[PDB]
Design a protein around this ligand. Structure first.
Ligand SMILES: [Fe+3]
Ligand SMILES: [Fe+3]
Lengths: 309, 309
């Protein structure tokens, strides 16, 4: 049996866990929490951690752990299975990307049309959007967005964008809350990840939603796709089973289990999401290098500088 | 007017040069030679080089130059244009990949069928292939193959493969010569890059060729796609024009010019090669990280160790 530190949304974890149990008879115990505290805790437990696997919303969360040598290597053959355009590869083969989440703009289509949308994510952080654009600065994908800005456009552009959000945007604690804020009409638009919308649409029927998704495309930084993944703890006592679980998540059955439950992009070529996602290729997402521990600290620095935290 | 140090096959360079001149009225002077000597020479000339642009068969050739800060940065927007699955991105935005070349096995179809081919590139380096498999150890893509082996399979596997080639394979000075050796029946099969074959087929008619291509697929290291690219010299006096030339090579018209002449894969999504190449996606090529200067030295070391050089 194995213990999974779960930084993914609960519905994602349960779905793959149940499937795995069903397929193999290995029981999975989930210890759920926010991707960051979890990463922190693993550093602190070191070789005494009870965790076997760490499953998180953002591969960027693996940077520190990998640098400190806390993660075990995966087979190259597994890694190759989810290697698609834009997907980061762990330099030490000690973590794997498994699903993609797109940055999107959600907006109230009963107040706006595509026609009112911007051609760049940069443009939302302006007075023109004063108190009209929601954002989530504590979001993991928000930080990746910052790193992407900095790498694609440079620090000044990035900083300006942050300062702009601070002055003009409405801050929400979580992506889900931001999405609700649009539906409830608190704000007309918000920057979040794609999956929340589709998920909400399935529960409620798109016909009943005020909100719709807008894709920035044309390789803008705001077209960023970031990835969720997993890693095996070097400290694990149950290597056979831990490895088996990570491999399963990269298999056709594990990808199917995940995509059925959550509107994230599968990374295997032979799996179709049932959610009718906007086709990857049409996203025109830019390719960005993997976020390193140093990239991470740097983005944090900018956020602070802009006075966001 | 600009001066291009040309490490690409002459027919590639001329074709893009002519096109560029035609489109812009800027004259291009080509100084042709082998990608390595050229790279060496640029190091040696430093800030006194007369080169404006360096155009080469293998992006790996840029590693040293970039490390020494000899290359100028390109626009991120240009870089994004050729960023496809598997394509390496320059960490300092100071070089760009422009076309892909696949590793392939060519074989005499009047002596063998696919059925006699191997499922892995590893298997050709065996006694079963004694004096029956041609290889080119001085080839730029050969070195990349070595790096890929080492990164995917580890050093021992790599070394074994090299030693195997040494004992069992027939060595040729160049890819073209290897290809001819198959046609002339000196060897039944050889490891080269895809473009030579297609090019030969167009001049001569496939119906007149003994040789055919075999793709290893399934993410084997022998399914490697490596890339040709260009860079602007930091020392250039003609930056405006040099940059314009690199941007042109990444444009639709520059990619078209190239693919018309040479059977390499375009990297832009809106360009179709007229050569009827095996579709990229069907190659099942593995994704490998960019070759660093250090990777390069390491591969050289293995080659030596195996007694190849
Ligand atoms: Fe989330
Ligand atoms: Fe060549």
């Amino acid at each position: 049996d194995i213990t999974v530190y779960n930084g993914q949304h609960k519905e994602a974890a349960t779905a793959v866990a149940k499937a795995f149990e069903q397929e193999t008879g290995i029981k999975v115990t989930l210890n759920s929490g926010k991707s960051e505290q979890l990463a922190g805790q693993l550093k602190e437990e070191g070789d005494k951690t009870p965790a076997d696997v760490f499953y998180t919303e953002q591969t960027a969360t693996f940077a520190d752990l990998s640098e400190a040598g806390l993660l075990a290597p995966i087979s190259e053959q597994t890694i190759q299975q989810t290697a698609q355009k834009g997907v980061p590869l762990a330099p030490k083969k000690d973590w794997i990307a498994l699903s993609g989440r797109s940055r999107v703009v959600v907006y109230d289509h009963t107040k706006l049309s595509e026609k009112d949308m911007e051609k760049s994510v940069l443009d939302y952080a302006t007075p023109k959007w004063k108190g009209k654009i929601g954002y989530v600065s504590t979001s993991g994908a928000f930080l990746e967005q910052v790193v992407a800005l900095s790498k694609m456009k440079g620090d000044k552009v990035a900083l300006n964008w942050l300062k702009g959000l601070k002055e003009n945007g409405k801050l929400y604690a979580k992506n889900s809350v931001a999405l609700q804020a649009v539906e409830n009409g608190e704000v007309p638009a918000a920057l979040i990840n794609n999956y929340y919308w589709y998920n909400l649409a399935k529960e409620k029927g798109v016909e009943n939603l005020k909100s719709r998704l807008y894709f920035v495309r044309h390789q803008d930084p705001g077209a960023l796709v970031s990835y969720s993944g997993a890693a095996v703890l070097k400290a694990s006592k149950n290597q056979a089973e831990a490895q088996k679980f990570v491999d399963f998540l990269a298999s056709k059955k594990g990808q199917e289990a995940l995509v059925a439950a959550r509107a994230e992009y599968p990374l295997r070529a032979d799996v179709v999401s049932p959610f009718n996602l906007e086709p990857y290729e049409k996203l025109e997402a830019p390719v960005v290098s993997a976020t390193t521990a140093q990239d991470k600290e740097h983005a944090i620095k900018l956020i602070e500088e802009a006075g966001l935290k």
